[PDB]
Amino acid sequence: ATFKVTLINEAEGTKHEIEVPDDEYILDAAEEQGYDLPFSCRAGACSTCAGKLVSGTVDQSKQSFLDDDQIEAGYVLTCVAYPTSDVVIQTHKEEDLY
Ligand code: FES
């Protein structure tokens, strides 16, 4: 499968559409497709690459930073998240945690 991923940057009012394989992390695909996104650890242990789901789902089982409540609230670590449906996500959401 290949999923459609819509990247929305609310602060800058930008929107990017990318296609991501079901076995590729969102971050990687974005970069390959020409859209640089924030990151630091690239290992699911920080909050630099955080995004917030608008719609769709993902598999971010490799993540270790977010707690259950943050996950329920829709936050995703883009560096270790695989899309599991078409997804709409707001990027650059780190500041939202604090
Ligand atoms: S860059 Fe650290 S969790 Fe994604």
Curated annotation (Swiss-Prot):
Coiled coil: none annotated. [2Fe-2S] cluster binds at residues 41, 46, 49, 79. GO terms for biological process: electron transport chain. Residues 3-95 form the 2Fe-2S ferredoxin-type domain. It comes from the Bacteria. Binds 1 [2Fe-2S] cluster. InterPro entries: 2Fe-2S_ferredoxin-like_sf, 2Fe-2S_ferredoxin-type, 2Fe2S_fd_BS, Beta-grasp_dom_sf, Fd_pln. Keywords: 2Fe-2S, Electron transport, Iron, Iron-sulfur, Metal-binding, Transport. Its cofactor is [2Fe-2S] cluster. Changing residue 94 to K: 20000-fold decrease in electron transfer. Belongs to the 2Fe2S plant-type ferredoxin family. Ferredoxins are iron-sulfur proteins that transfer electrons in a wide variety of metabolic reactions. Forms a complex with heterodimeric ferredoxin-thioredoxin reductase (FTR) and thioredoxin. This is Ferredoxin-1.
